[PDB]
């Protein structure tokens with residue numbers, strides 16, 4: 001529950017808490033195991049226990065799945081699926097769009113449809129992710145995608161978060177205008193972050209959203225959405241993205257939260273309409 005002795009620690013996969021590739025004899029069975037740092041504070045331990053609880057809610061092919069736990073003894077462990085290809089941002093970065101390692105346009109749509117399906121599931125639970133982005137997705141065998149949430153602290157993605165002393169850490173470049181101005185999050189702001197995530201996929205993660213603008217400019221842009229005088233600025237159409245699919249992204253960035261398409265409609269478009 002889970003038998004900790006059945007675990008065989010093999011390699012470190014990354015870094016609050018280390019993640020390790022482990023083997024389970026059942027024989028070539030691989031899992032990911034997250035362990036609390038030896039010097040974790042009482043606050044870190046509490047957060048870890050809550051992550052376990054939140055994660056235990058989530059049961060979908062395109063969401064990270066809690067396979068097991070070791071909490072009745074120290075140190076605390078969380079066990080998930082091992083996703084061979086690591087995070088989606090690093091994965092796409094190592095690929096180029098097929099001409100005429102490579103990835104094809106239809107494969108990009110399949111990646112995006114899987115994210116939409118995972119988010120469709122979350123919406124059914126009335127669960128708001130709050131930090132959807134390619135950096136929070138993992139890639140397994142055969143371009144299979146699982147949405148996760150690594151938190152906001154990793155050095156690699158430091159530049160994706162706006163930090164003011166004593167305030168919540170904010171992924172402003174993925175955030176709906178109402179999130180920036182009022183600091184609250186909904187399924188409708190998850191849709192907006194999905195539009196930005198889809199922009200990243202079609203960019204093959206080559207540039208930060210609004211990359212040529214400062215943090216302060218991105219925040220003032222939310223103000224311009226609010227005022228609605230036609231001065232707001234949008235992510236440009238990626239090279240690999242045709243106009244029809246771009247117009248979908250634009251609906252995700254509608255000023256009015258109710259005008260943003262539900263994830264059920266987004267999934268339909270990506271899995272069906274976008275095929276023609």
Ligand SMILES: Cc1ccc([C@H](C)Nc2nc3cc(F)ccc3o2)cc1NC(=O)c1cnc2ccccn12
Pocket residue numbers: 013014019032033034051054055058064078079080081082083084085086087129138147148149150151
């Ligand atoms: C073992 C574990 C525990 C926890 C988590 C994730 C980060 N925790 C998490 N997601 C959430 C999604 C929500 F909606 C809400 C809360 C969430 O909390 C992930 C993992 N697994 C890996 O990180 C992993 C697997 N395969 C590889 C390959 C390379 C690198 C890393 N990995």
